[PDB]
Amino acid sequence: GEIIYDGGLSSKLADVVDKTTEPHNADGAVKDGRIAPVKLDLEKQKLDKL
Amino acid sequence: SKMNVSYRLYIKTPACLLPLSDYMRAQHDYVSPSSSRVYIKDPAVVYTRS
Numbered sequence: 001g002e003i004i005y006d007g008g009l010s011s012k013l014a015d016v017v018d019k020t021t022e023p024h025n026a027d028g029a030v031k032d033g034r035i036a037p038v039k040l041d042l043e044k045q046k047l048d049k050l
Numbered sequence: 051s052k053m054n055v056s057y058r059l060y061i062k063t064p065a066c067l068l069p070l071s072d073y074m075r076a077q078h079d080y081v082s083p084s085s086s087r088v089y090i091k092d093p094a095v096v097y098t099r100s
Contacts, residue, residue: 023097037097 025032068076 023095025099
């Protein structure tokens, strides 16, 4: 017979980034006006620059 | 040995030496950790989203 429903484009709720991401603030629907997180080179092992 | 040797020197028996009949005193146990363990080479990153 005639086909009324056979499927279609399916909407997915979540996009799961399968990779390690550096820390970030809000972007997209909510944009964060504050400064980005400061990357601090702390907890050094060998003593450089001192 | 009885005629030509004049003077003899004696020391306490070294603990290194062990008779062959006492071989079971040399049996010892060593523990090697499981091969399923994985050792981590990556640092831990601290972050917050406020």
